């Protein structure tokens, strides 16, 4: 009866690769962010609107 | 006792680097402020800090084994 | 074929997608919330991942957690479904870039067509007729706003271009409250959907909701399946949807279908989506595009014989359309009737446990849901708990079966909208077929002494 | 149309007929036994009549009580269905004469075709090929019996012309036990069906059960719908039936269909009935006619789109055929899988209560039954409790859905033949399609040490 | 007490003929051997005899009202 299952675990061998420089973090709130989104919102975490560093240029 | 659970989803790593000592290990107790594991997600190797000071009774996961939200990680008695 | 995918959704559409996946031999991954641990589709899936707590924003909209699940399990695509992250163009961008395949349109068209006004503009450019209105987002030139209002003709309606779910729309009776109505509508749009864009569009008083389904692989192929008609609505929310629509002669069918196919080719559309419309006196006035798989998808599947989800999963695997425009046929007539956990009159959700449940079954009757005995409805998301169907060789037969199936159906423990469905089915005008969208709203009536 | 009819049957076919009646707006009368008080079709019917105690002979075969019910309620016809009084030609005679309409063939053809040997003789006269055999009921001329046995070729099988339900048939390996085998077969036929007629027919070792469905109004119109194939059998009892049959090119389809239509015209056949056959090396050898509505009727309904019961109820109302031979189309492929209350291996009925039940649902999946939670299966009749289906655009898709549906399905409290259905579905040869009737019997295997 | 039930299906008549006295009527008790009603079926007006001698407490049916198998007819206390 599928209504009562075993609650099996996931297989570790499965492995997918995400590019390194496409996901950033905001330590102010902890919400992971999409680097291009943050960089397009003038380095402003859209979650908590916490300003961050920006390059002079 | 208490069980601390991963608050996000991602690969489970205990050693911060490919060849590194584990942040914690069975036996040695931890305190409120200390990193217990690494939950990688999108190459951003995050860290987990306990909330109740006590002995590390056991570790319910293994390095390289993906974990889900609220997935129990370690039980503190 | 896609070696594995993630069902980034929950429930009826989640279970339906799971069935389609297992059919095509594509392993499945169920991303659930902590409250939805014992869903049907969750329990029938290969691998289950929990991404957050009960609320929608923490768990199912947690795009980071969904991508986490998709990366850990090794998927090579994801199905969002409809609702949650269906039209979030940014979700599409992130899924595209993260390394996975977004089952549906490319994010670019999500952005172009998720803005209602840009959608209508592109439609005008592509030859699709459009409703009279602002022809642009509303500015603060009250003089121009009232000039346009006079030009199209009162009454008028304010709709947030970034709004959704039949909310954030207000009818303006005159200029007296035009400014305040616009301000409060913009405020509601900002509060809910974070977007302030508002626009003015003519108001029609005698519409007959139409929508024509289209499949395009994004490689210059775009076909149009059978029509639809969601005329019956309560608070602009559909309840009953008949497919095809009465009185749509094949001439109009093909006429509008060719234009919609050309539009899909021009936009380079990929995935399954539906061009809503509005109908009266033999005319069509585009009003939106639901660039996803709608909710009343079945009522085109049973009359066309084509499984839409399988077509989507094939397009996502890169396969072009395997069905020509000519080889698509509409053989008969259908009807659909959603089941929802609301009070039959107050329209207040009444989540709870289902003590007893009994499917209709019988010829021509299709029961899509996940509910079952012991299943405590979570008081945390939409109120739909089943999309029931009854296919007939004509409208009379299909209604008849519906009546019989609704008779058979028992769902106990939580009040539901079955009484209303029976009463609509027995309605004389509805059985005739061809009511205006308001029909149900007008039957509601008004105050009594 | 018939102003009212009586469902002279019980269960899956009873409920199905009830749905068809309510569809056509023909009031319904449910004649039940005292044990079948809380059947589904009983509870969903307008008027319920109890005609006898639990046993079949006292209550459901009590032709007097059924006619009593039909007279008191004012019916103008009766549906027997299949089983109970399906082929009792005398029941047809009495119903005809009492003043009501017998939904089905006229009793005359019931008598002609219920005798297997006369049926085969008339078929030979009408051009339908027939199996080599006695060409007449077996007498006591043992010399002639053995001469015919030598002429057709051993091995041979003895079948009672008045037998039914896959019983009362024995295989004769040689003349050594020919006399005793014949005597005991005749004795069993006398004991069970009260008829002693026995006949000799050639034995085939590599058959592929076929049967072609035909509708004739009895007014010179007889059409042939899609084919069928019940290859899988256990103890000559069908379990799985695919419609149409693999490898039956349209040439053979039309070739045999035209002959069967001509046969129906010659017999002046009225009602829905099916000419069984046997297939090998591109040949057909008539073996029987089930002058009723078979059990695997759906698998022609979903591929042809025509509701057979409605066609019957129209013919009984005097309406000629409303469907031409050309306008009938087979669009796709189907599969069916009976559910029975037997032990999965011992094949012993296990009646009881069903604690928990959950229909499959999902696209293309049809669930016919009456069972539900709290329904105590009566240990008093046949062991069938559901005819489940899964229509696909090809055999692979249909099997896939079946697998998924069987996965979903839960029936708890009584053992059932679901494990066996799953195992058959997973079978490689079956998925290829085209096994001989024995396939399942041979898989059974034999003794092990 | 006891309830005697029609053993067959058919129209229920209490007076044997169109204008006739009822075989039995409330009040007056019956015996084991006595006709209580008529259950017509195919114009063959059959008859029902009690099995337990006792008072006719009441009649649960009415003339002209069809009855089914084992349909309770009269209860004897
Ligand atoms: N211009 C209009 N005139 C009249 N009714 C409209 C108009 N626009 C929308 N509606 C009503 O609102 C319904 C939903 O409109 P739509 O733009 O699809 O909003 P949503 O995005 O909330 O579904 C339509 O089916 C129609 O009944
Ligand atoms: N002449 C025959 N040769 C081989 N198998 C037969 C023959 N006659 C019957 N059978 C087997 O028995 C099954 C039932 O035969 P049928 O005459 O239809 O009996 P019933 O009336 O019991 O259904 C057939 O489908 C076939 O598998
Ligand atoms: C990127 O290549 C995806 C795999 C994760 C690599 C990192 S290196 C640091 C951690 N140690 C380890 O074994 N894998 C993790
Ligand atoms: C035949 O005409 C059917 C009706 C039954 C007629 C008989 S006459 C004797 C019984 N009395 C009565 O009122 N009807 C019954
Ligand atoms: Mg819409
Ligand atoms: Mg047979
Ligand atoms: Zn932040």
PDB file of N, CA and C in Angstrom, chain D residues 37-86:
ATOM      1  N   UNK D  37     -28.054  -6.124  -0.360  1.00  0.00           N
ATOM      2  CA  UNK D  37     -28.885  -4.958  -0.084  1.00  0.00           C
ATOM      3  C   UNK D  37     -28.114  -3.660  -0.257  1.00  0.00           C
ATOM      4  N   UNK D  38     -26.846  -3.631   0.153  1.00  0.00           N
ATOM      5  CA  UNK D  38     -26.051  -2.412   0.127  1.00  0.00           C
ATOM      6  C   UNK D  38     -25.034  -2.403  -1.008  1.00  0.00           C
ATOM      7  N   UNK D  39     -25.380  -2.963  -2.163  1.00  0.00           N
ATOM      8  CA  UNK D  39     -24.546  -2.760  -3.337  1.00  0.00           C
ATOM      9  C   UNK D  39     -24.582  -1.300  -3.757  1.00  0.00           C
ATOM     10  N   UNK D  40     -23.544  -0.890  -4.478  1.00  0.00           N
ATOM     11  CA  UNK D  40     -23.534   0.452  -5.036  1.00  0.00           C
ATOM     12  C   UNK D  40     -24.730   0.653  -5.958  1.00  0.00           C
ATOM     13  N   UNK D  41     -24.798  -0.120  -7.046  1.00  0.00           N
ATOM     14  CA  UNK D  41     -25.858   0.091  -8.026  1.00  0.00           C
ATOM     15  C   UNK D  41     -27.231   0.002  -7.383  1.00  0.00           C
ATOM     16  N   UNK D  42     -27.374  -0.818  -6.343  1.00  0.00           N
ATOM     17  CA  UNK D  42     -28.643  -0.881  -5.626  1.00  0.00           C
ATOM     18  C   UNK D  42     -28.948   0.462  -4.981  1.00  0.00           C
ATOM     19  N   UNK D  43     -27.970   1.030  -4.276  1.00  0.00           N
ATOM     20  CA  UNK D  43     -28.216   2.267  -3.548  1.00  0.00           C
ATOM     21  C   UNK D  43     -28.378   3.464  -4.473  1.00  0.00           C
ATOM     22  N   UNK D  44     -27.776   3.432  -5.657  1.00  0.00           N
ATOM     23  CA  UNK D  44     -27.867   4.540  -6.596  1.00  0.00           C
ATOM     24  C   UNK D  44     -29.070   4.435  -7.519  1.00  0.00           C
ATOM     25  N   UNK D  45     -29.956   3.475  -7.290  1.00  0.00           N
ATOM     26  CA  UNK D  45     -31.068   3.227  -8.191  1.00  0.00           C
ATOM     27  C   UNK D  45     -32.354   3.846  -7.656  1.00  0.00           C
ATOM     28  N   UNK D  46     -33.292   4.081  -8.575  1.00  0.00           N
ATOM     29  CA  UNK D  46     -34.568   4.681  -8.201  1.00  0.00           C
ATOM     30  C   UNK D  46     -35.349   3.767  -7.268  1.00  0.00           C
ATOM     31  N   UNK D  47     -35.535   2.510  -7.667  1.00  0.00           N
ATOM     32  CA  UNK D  47     -36.427   1.592  -6.971  1.00  0.00           C
ATOM     33  C   UNK D  47     -35.759   0.232  -6.842  1.00  0.00           C
ATOM     34  N   UNK D  48     -35.722  -0.288  -5.618  1.00  0.00           N
ATOM     35  CA  UNK D  48     -35.012  -1.516  -5.291  1.00  0.00           C
ATOM     36  C   UNK D  48     -36.007  -2.587  -4.876  1.00  0.00           C
ATOM     37  N   UNK D  49     -35.863  -3.781  -5.451  1.00  0.00           N
ATOM     38  CA  UNK D  49     -36.738  -4.912  -5.166  1.00  0.00           C
ATOM     39  C   UNK D  49     -35.879  -6.093  -4.741  1.00  0.00           C
ATOM     40  N   UNK D  50     -36.297  -6.775  -3.678  1.00  0.00           N
ATOM     41  CA  UNK D  50     -35.661  -8.005  -3.224  1.00  0.00           C
ATOM     42  C   UNK D  50     -36.480  -9.188  -3.727  1.00  0.00           C
ATOM     43  N   UNK D  51     -35.821 -10.143  -4.380  1.00  0.00           N
ATOM     44  CA  UNK D  51     -36.525 -11.243  -5.031  1.00  0.00           C
ATOM     45  C   UNK D  51     -36.253 -12.599  -4.399  1.00  0.00           C
ATOM     46  N   UNK D  52     -35.280 -12.718  -3.497  1.00  0.00           N
ATOM     47  CA  UNK D  52     -35.015 -13.993  -2.872  1.00  0.00           C
ATOM     48  C   UNK D  52     -33.861 -13.989  -1.891  1.00  0.00           C
ATOM     49  N   UNK D  53     -33.562 -15.159  -1.321  1.00  0.00           N
ATOM     50  CA  UNK D  53     -32.435 -15.268  -0.385  1.00  0.00           C
ATOM     51  C   UNK D  53     -31.083 -15.310  -1.079  1.00  0.00           C
ATOM     52  N   UNK D  54     -30.017 -15.410  -0.290  1.00  0.00           N
ATOM     53  CA  UNK D  54     -28.663 -15.253  -0.816  1.00  0.00           C
ATOM     54  C   UNK D  54     -28.355 -16.140  -2.015  1.00  0.00           C
ATOM     55  N   UNK D  55     -28.708 -17.422  -2.032  1.00  0.00           N
ATOM     56  CA  UNK D  55     -28.259 -18.287  -3.128  1.00  0.00           C
ATOM     57  C   UNK D  55     -28.755 -17.812  -4.487  1.00  0.00           C
ATOM     58  N   UNK D  56     -28.001 -18.190  -5.524  1.00  0.00           N
ATOM     59  CA  UNK D  56     -28.321 -17.756  -6.881  1.00  0.00           C
ATOM     60  C   UNK D  56     -29.651 -18.327  -7.351  1.00  0.00           C
ATOM     61  N   UNK D  57     -29.893 -19.611  -7.082  1.00  0.00           N
ATOM     62  CA  UNK D  57     -31.062 -20.279  -7.647  1.00  0.00           C
ATOM     63  C   UNK D  57     -32.336 -19.760  -7.003  1.00  0.00           C
ATOM     64  N   UNK D  58     -32.305 -19.525  -5.693  1.00  0.00           N
ATOM     65  CA  UNK D  58     -33.502 -19.074  -5.002  1.00  0.00           C
ATOM     66  C   UNK D  58     -33.890 -17.649  -5.379  1.00  0.00           C
ATOM     67  N   UNK D  59     -32.914 -16.778  -5.643  1.00  0.00           N
ATOM     68  CA  UNK D  59     -33.171 -15.347  -5.727  1.00  0.00           C
ATOM     69  C   UNK D  59     -32.956 -14.764  -7.117  1.00  0.00           C
ATOM     70  N   UNK D  60     -31.756 -14.868  -7.677  1.00  0.00           N
ATOM     71  CA  UNK D  60     -31.490 -14.158  -8.922  1.00  0.00           C
ATOM     72  C   UNK D  60     -31.919 -14.943 -10.148  1.00  0.00           C
ATOM     73  N   UNK D  61     -31.937 -16.265 -10.065  1.00  0.00           N
ATOM     74  CA  UNK D  61     -32.444 -17.091 -11.145  1.00  0.00           C
ATOM     75  C   UNK D  61     -33.944 -17.338 -11.024  1.00  0.00           C
ATOM     76  N   UNK D  62     -34.584 -16.766 -10.005  1.00  0.00           N
ATOM     77  CA  UNK D  62     -36.011 -16.944  -9.746  1.00  0.00           C
ATOM     78  C   UNK D  62     -36.818 -16.136 -10.763  1.00  0.00           C
ATOM     79  N   UNK D  63     -36.763 -16.589 -12.013  1.00  0.00           N
ATOM     80  CA  UNK D  63     -37.406 -15.893 -13.128  1.00  0.00           C
ATOM     81  C   UNK D  63     -38.791 -15.406 -12.715  1.00  0.00           C
ATOM     82  N   UNK D  64     -39.576 -16.206 -11.992  1.00  0.00           N
ATOM     83  CA  UNK D  64     -40.878 -15.698 -11.539  1.00  0.00           C
ATOM     84  C   UNK D  64     -40.783 -14.431 -10.712  1.00  0.00           C
ATOM     85  N   UNK D  65     -39.838 -14.352  -9.775  1.00  0.00           N
ATOM     86  CA  UNK D  65     -39.746 -13.162  -8.935  1.00  0.00           C
ATOM     87  C   UNK D  65     -39.292 -11.949  -9.738  1.00  0.00           C
ATOM     88  N   UNK D  66     -38.382 -12.150 -10.691  1.00  0.00           N
ATOM     89  CA  UNK D  66     -37.940 -11.047 -11.539  1.00  0.00           C
ATOM     90  C   UNK D  66     -39.101 -10.524 -12.372  1.00  0.00           C
ATOM     91  N   UNK D  67     -39.883 -11.426 -12.968  1.00  0.00           N
ATOM     92  CA  UNK D  67     -41.034 -10.953 -13.730  1.00  0.00           C
ATOM     93  C   UNK D  67     -42.047 -10.294 -12.804  1.00  0.00           C
ATOM     94  N   UNK D  68     -42.173 -10.783 -11.570  1.00  0.00           N
ATOM     95  CA  UNK D  68     -43.049 -10.127 -10.604  1.00  0.00           C
ATOM     96  C   UNK D  68     -42.629  -8.682 -10.397  1.00  0.00           C
ATOM     97  N   UNK D  69     -41.349  -8.472 -10.093  1.00  0.00           N
ATOM     98  CA  UNK D  69     -40.842  -7.118  -9.927  1.00  0.00           C
ATOM     99  C   UNK D  69     -41.119  -6.283 -11.167  1.00  0.00           C
ATOM    100  N   UNK D  70     -40.832  -6.831 -12.348  1.00  0.00           N
ATOM    101  CA  UNK D  70     -40.990  -6.057 -13.572  1.00  0.00           C
ATOM    102  C   UNK D  70     -42.445  -5.666 -13.795  1.00  0.00           C
ATOM    103  N   UNK D  71     -43.384  -6.519 -13.383  1.00  0.00           N
ATOM    104  CA  UNK D  71     -44.792  -6.180 -13.565  1.00  0.00           C
ATOM    105  C   UNK D  71     -45.262  -5.163 -12.533  1.00  0.00           C
ATOM    106  N   UNK D  72     -44.803  -5.280 -11.287  1.00  0.00           N
ATOM    107  CA  UNK D  72     -45.313  -4.389 -10.249  1.00  0.00           C
ATOM    108  C   UNK D  72     -44.823  -2.965 -10.471  1.00  0.00           C
ATOM    109  N   UNK D  73     -43.577  -2.803 -10.925  1.00  0.00           N
ATOM    110  CA  UNK D  73     -43.006  -1.474 -11.095  1.00  0.00           C
ATOM    111  C   UNK D  73     -43.391  -0.814 -12.411  1.00  0.00           C
ATOM    112  N   UNK D  74     -43.974  -1.551 -13.349  1.00  0.00           N
ATOM    113  CA  UNK D  74     -44.423  -0.944 -14.586  1.00  0.00           C
ATOM    114  C   UNK D  74     -43.383  -0.864 -15.676  1.00  0.00           C
ATOM    115  N   UNK D  75     -42.298  -1.627 -15.575  1.00  0.00           N
ATOM    116  CA  UNK D  75     -41.283  -1.604 -16.612  1.00  0.00           C
ATOM    117  C   UNK D  75     -41.901  -1.968 -17.960  1.00  0.00           C
ATOM    118  N   UNK D  76     -41.122  -1.775 -19.018  1.00  0.00           N
ATOM    119  CA  UNK D  76     -41.539  -2.187 -20.353  1.00  0.00           C
ATOM    120  C   UNK D  76     -40.385  -2.907 -21.032  1.00  0.00           C
ATOM    121  N   UNK D  77     -39.430  -3.379 -20.239  1.00  0.00           N
ATOM    122  CA  UNK D  77     -38.291  -4.131 -20.743  1.00  0.00           C
ATOM    123  C   UNK D  77     -37.453  -4.535 -19.540  1.00  0.00           C
ATOM    124  N   UNK D  78     -36.435  -5.350 -19.796  1.00  0.00           N
ATOM    125  CA  UNK D  78     -35.501  -5.770 -18.762  1.00  0.00           C
ATOM    126  C   UNK D  78     -34.130  -5.962 -19.391  1.00  0.00           C
ATOM    127  N   UNK D  79     -33.089  -5.634 -18.634  1.00  0.00           N
ATOM    128  CA  UNK D  79     -31.723  -5.932 -19.040  1.00  0.00           C
ATOM    129  C   UNK D  79     -31.209  -7.082 -18.189  1.00  0.00           C
ATOM    130  N   UNK D  80     -30.865  -8.227 -18.773  1.00  0.00           N
ATOM    131  CA  UNK D  80     -30.307  -9.320 -17.971  1.00  0.00           C
ATOM    132  C   UNK D  80     -28.833  -9.111 -17.673  1.00  0.00           C
ATOM    133  N   UNK D  81     -28.122  -8.538 -18.637  1.00  0.00           N
ATOM    134  CA  UNK D  81     -26.689  -8.379 -18.533  1.00  0.00           C
ATOM    135  C   UNK D  81     -25.969  -9.624 -18.992  1.00  0.00           C
ATOM    136  N   UNK D  82     -24.889  -9.999 -18.291  1.00  0.00           N
ATOM    137  CA  UNK D  82     -24.130 -11.250 -18.587  1.00  0.00           C
ATOM    138  C   UNK D  82     -24.030 -12.064 -17.300  1.00  0.00           C
ATOM    139  N   UNK D  83     -24.159 -13.392 -17.417  1.00  0.00           N
ATOM    140  CA  UNK D  83     -24.199 -14.271 -16.228  1.00  0.00           C
ATOM    141  C   UNK D  83     -25.640 -14.427 -15.780  1.00  0.00           C
ATOM    142  N   UNK D  84     -25.912 -14.979 -14.593  1.00  0.00           N
ATOM    143  CA  UNK D  84     -27.328 -15.223 -14.176  1.00  0.00           C
ATOM    144  C   UNK D  84     -28.180 -15.625 -15.386  1.00  0.00           C
ATOM    145  N   UNK D  85     -29.164 -14.795 -15.757  1.00  0.00           N
ATOM    146  CA  UNK D  85     -30.050 -15.223 -16.870  1.00  0.00           C
ATOM    147  C   UNK D  85     -29.641 -14.595 -18.214  1.00  0.00           C
ATOM    148  N   UNK D  86     -28.366 -14.630 -18.591  1.00  0.00           N
ATOM    149  CA  UNK D  86     -27.932 -13.997 -19.827  1.00  0.00           C
ATOM    150  C   UNK D  86     -28.410 -14.767 -21.048  1.00  0.00           C
TER     151      UNK D  86
END
